[PDB]
Swiss-Prot record:
This is Apoptotic protease-activating factor 1. It is found in: Cytoplasm. Oligomeric Apaf-1 mediates the cytochrome c-dependent autocatalytic activation of pro-caspase-9 (Apaf-3), leading to the activation of caspase-3 and apoptosis. This activation requires ATP. Isoform 6 is less effective in inducing apoptosis. Induction: By E2F and p53/TP53 in apoptotic neurons. Translation is inhibited by HNRPA1, which binds to the IRES of APAF1 mRNAs.
Amino acid sequence: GPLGSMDAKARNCLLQHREALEKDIKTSYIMDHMISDGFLTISEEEKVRNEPTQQQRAAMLIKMILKKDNDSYVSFYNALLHEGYKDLAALLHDGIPVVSSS
């Protein structure tokens, strides 16, 4: 039984804000912070990096989040804060049940 999965309200606040999703959700340093965080494995890194441009690259980063978990989502969330994308992440903070905690 999967526990601590990605919350619907959380995952939605992220993807639903497609108003700025594809527009501000980057994959460069954001993924760097996620892999260094240890949430994105070499396989994860490979897929996103396999894609040629922000097209399927950023889409792949967001596409991973489509079926990851709360833990990874808060990591992807934290990565947004790592690259000055606090606004998008704030839009997702509604679903994130933590306030840094670091």
